Symmetry: D2
Subunit: 84 residues, 4 copies
């Protein structure tokens, strides 16, 4: 249920394709389009929709950011080190 | 050092202003501009820069996403419930 | 060759589908994804690529902005009135 | 009143500062933030607001795209050549 647990789950699913979202294969460009569209959706939901809708969009944004981390070999420690 | 720990730290700093980034006062629009500009920076860094640069940009994005959550009263449980 | 001429060409192609890009049918959400992704690409090219590459990305952005105008029934006069 | 005329007006105002918006001085990064935030505003207005509000946001996006062209030395011919 932790951010760290779900991330390790994604690193394993990326070790290989046709089941769960394999954007890692498509690459940075494809993942970047999603990050960018989701950020706009997060802003949109935060402004016009309810808390639940905003939380759903935020989860999609986080998911794609995590996928981008997996695609570039970035770890939670690398990111956390900067969150300070 | 956990995503959950840093988030609770921000919820407290939002209980009041002029010290650490108080975007919560400015509102959703101000935070949204940041989320959107940071997403594009994340994509840019992921494509042209190194792993560390990408991780720094990602941390900035996550920070602003967390701020947006604080501003809208969204909790980690709300978001995590959707990450599944 | 004028912005105004190409726009009127697009308004006609939207009067009906399967030839040239018919995003008007898919709707605002689909065109919005493109505008938001191209905006980031424009920023990216402007920063890391040459003038021609940046011009190509800018043309893609303008095209999708124009499509959004068509999809929402917005005219050049409506927009131009605000450009002042 | 034409896209081409307003653009030539901006090229002259960029020949020098403190009157009309001088982004050109601040550079690509500052203009890029605007392009990226305006694209999200364009999408937002297109989805939730009226035609006029969408037109106003579109005008702001075009203005900044034009400024970006000025800042990078890109001409209308360069862009128009690609719009085909």
């Amino acid at each position: 249920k932790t951010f760290e647990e779900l991330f390790t789950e994604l690193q394993h699913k990326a070790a290989n394709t046709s089941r769960t979202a394999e954007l890692v294969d498509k690459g940075v460009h494809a993942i970047g389009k999603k990050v960018v569209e989701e950020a706009a959706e997060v802003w949109m939901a935060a402004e016009y929709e309810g808390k639940d809708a905003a939380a759903e969009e935020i989860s999609q944004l986080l998911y794609h950011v995590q996928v981008m981390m997996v695609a570039r070999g970035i770890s939670l420690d690398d990111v956390y080190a900067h969150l300070l």
